[PDB]
Subunit: 148 residues, 3 copies
């Protein structure tokens, strides 16, 4: 990748690598519970600390794709820096969500969803440029300067 | 993103944005179930509609990646319009599947497959340009005006 | 896609197409168990052969995203080949893992963590160029 382009994406790469790392921790806190006992042959059903964890993780796993989607499409189709930061904030809400899904009873982060607004915004940033592009395509050109 | 390039991808972006929205609906019809499922937290096995819902949705979740894969690779390596439409059609089959899952509790429908030929095609388009490239790489530069004596 | 660029990604595309195919196989060996025994909703402890399969598969399904992530970012921020080969190696570990999660009466191979170093490496490749870029940005 030519140093130039690499610039207009760096942040997105960064934030992505971050989520990639955090993504591992989530998948790590799940290994622990699998370990805490019978886990020998990674059984999915140890209850409690394992069920609450696998759930919390298997919830953020279903988000990642759809998140990354907006994350990049928004940052490319328009802005980047804003998209890049929004994506960072997501990483935090994700943390707070995953964490809040710990246990100790009580309706623990019952929500399957979470980011919402964050991806909603990222989606708009994408639906933004996606449209503004269609302009620069018609009225962006046109501008016939028949300088006869 | 230079207005030019943005063009040869717009549809892909569009279709993707679509799937992204629909994707939310899927994860929303799942939130309703855990809600109506009067209880505290959120668990993998509850009730009938919830069980059926989470399954349906958690089936399309395993799809998206492998689908987005071909969607783009097909749209980049071989014509963006045909790729974009394929993915579009795919979004529809998805709807019909997700909807048909648990809505009828009938003996047609279930499965963890959904659109097969839709991604197969997308795959081919990728395996298409991917090969035709090796021609442009190898032969695409071969001309015998060098036999010119 | 201009022939030039297509070059600096073909490997990634290829390997990606592979994992996409293998990805189908995994989801296929899951179809085999489901259709025989019953289950319109596959969320409860299924027949062993089926429970083992869906778990194995629904285990690589959580990987793919985070994998593809490093696969590309590493193959882009850091040169093509190695990143590509890395991902290729991963596809193999995947196979062995998924396969090792098959059997019957065998000590099944757990730790949903599969290919720790593989993606660790790919991650570094990314964190690599990601930094080296900041240099060329300042000290160029
Ligand atoms: C990220 C890294 C730089 C490449 C290092 C890395 O190699 C990975 C690590 C770090 C750790 C402890 C294994 C290590 O390097 O020592 N863990 C555990 C960890 C420990 C502390 C912290 I804070 C965060 C994570 C990983 C866990 C998973 C992983 O990929 C594979 C993988 C497979 C399935 C996944 C499912 C859901 C979701 C993700 C899934 N991922 C790589 C690593
Ligand atoms: C899509 C949008 C334009 C960015 C708006 C948006 O921000 C989200 C919406 C729409 C919303 C909030 C305005 C609403 O519910 O009314 N819902 C609920 C909704 C309502 C109507 C319809 I038709 C479809 C979905 C969302 C649900 C989830 C979401 O992200 C996070 C998320 C987390 C996990 C996911 C797992 C699988 C799959 C996806 C996962 N997503 C964003 C939104
Ligand atoms: C060219 C192509 C990309 C392989 C497309 C394709 O054609 C698909 C195939 C192969 C096929 C059509 C010859 C078949 O046997 O049915 N199968 C079954 C198969 C047969 C032999 C072997 I080895 C491997 C898989 C598919 C199964 C699912 C599929 O949708 C994508 C998909 C769907 C659900 C998934 C769930 C989890 C995780 C990933 C998921 N992915 C496409 C195909």
């Amino acid at each position: 990748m030519d140093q130039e382009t690499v610039g207009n994406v760096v942040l997105l790469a960064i934030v992505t690598l971050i989520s990639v790392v955090q993504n591992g921790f989530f998948a790590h806190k799940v290994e622990h519970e699998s370990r805490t006992q019978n886990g020998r042959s990674f059984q999915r059903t140890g209850t409690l600390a394992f069920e609450r964890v696998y759930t919390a993780n298997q919830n953020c796993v279903d988000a990642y794709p759809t998140f990354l989607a907006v994350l990049w499409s928004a940052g490319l189709l328009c802005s980047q820096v804003p998209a890049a930061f929004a994506g960072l904030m997501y990483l935090f809400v994700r943390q707070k969500y995953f964490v809040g899904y710990l246990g100790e009873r009580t309706q623990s982060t019952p929500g399957y969803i979470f980011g919402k607004r964050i991806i909603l915004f990222l989606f708009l940033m994408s639906v933004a440029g996606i449209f503004n592009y269609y302009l620069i395509f018609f009225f962006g050109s046109d501008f016939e300067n028949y300088i006869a």
